[PDB]
Design a protein around this ligand. Structure first.
Ligand SMILES: Nc1ncnc2c1ncn2[C@@H]1O[C@H](COP(=O)(O)O)[C@@H](O)[C@H]1O
Ligand SMILES: Nc1ncnc2c1ncn2[C@@H]1O[C@H](COP(=O)(O)O)[C@@H](O)[C@H]1O
Ligand SMILES: Nc1ncnc2c1ncn2[C@@H]1O[C@H](COP(=O)(O)O)[C@@H](O)[C@H]1O
Ligand SMILES: Nc1ncnc2c1ncn2[C@@H]1O[C@H](COP(=O)(O)O)[C@@H](O)[C@H]1O
Length: 104
């Protein structure tokens, strides 16, 4: 919805995200899935430089991604680590929503 919330929802300072902990917090509230980008925020913000009006943008190269995917046990997850391009909604020069991995 905005850059600060995007960072909280989608940028991790560890590849080894503790999914069962973080996904249970208010921001994620035990939802099925969330993708985190294992990176410092600066190169992530740069994806959207100069983009004013809302537009989906696929990154030009790959980043390290840590996905929390729910199992069939309520609010218990498995972590998956990978690299890929990813797509974000850019608005006012910052990522404000995570769209997808590999494609918009
Ligand atoms: N067009 C869409 N329809 C349904 N879900 C979407 C769409 N675009 C993005 N999402 C999902 O929204 C979630 C991320 O939203 P957010 O955490 O608010 O950035 C991800 O699970 C996305 O897969
Ligand atoms: N472009 C989009 N179109 C429709 N729904 C979306 C889109 N982006 C995010 N969402 C919805 O917002 C949810 C995530 O928002 P939040 O719960 O605020 O993290 C996802 O499960 C999606 O259903
Ligand atoms: N979870 C999601 N994340 C990102 N994009 C989505 C998601 N679910 C649906 N979409 C996109 O939203 C559009 C409509 O999806 P659908 O409801 O499957 O017809 C399509 O362009 C899908 O690729
Ligand atoms: N970019 C996307 N990310 C996540 N889920 C998606 C995306 N595009 C479509 N979907 C959902 O994934 C499922 C695809 O169904 P199908 O096309 O029958 O394999 C539908 O529930 C779509 O809403």
């Amino acid at each position: 919805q905005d850059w600060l919330t995007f960072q909280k929802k989608h940028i991790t300072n560890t590849r080894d995200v503790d999914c069962d902990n973080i996904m249970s917090t208010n921001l994620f509230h035990c939802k099925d899935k969330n993708t985190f980008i294992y990176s410092r925020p600066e190169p992530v913000k740069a994806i959207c430089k100069g983009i004013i009006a809302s537009k989906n943008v696929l990154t030009t190269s790959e980043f390290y991604l840590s996905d929390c995917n729910v199992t069939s046990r309520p609010c218990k997850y498995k972590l998956k680590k990978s690299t890929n391009k990813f797509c974000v909604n850019c608005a006012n020069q910052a990522p404000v929503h995570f769209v997808g991995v590999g494609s918009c």
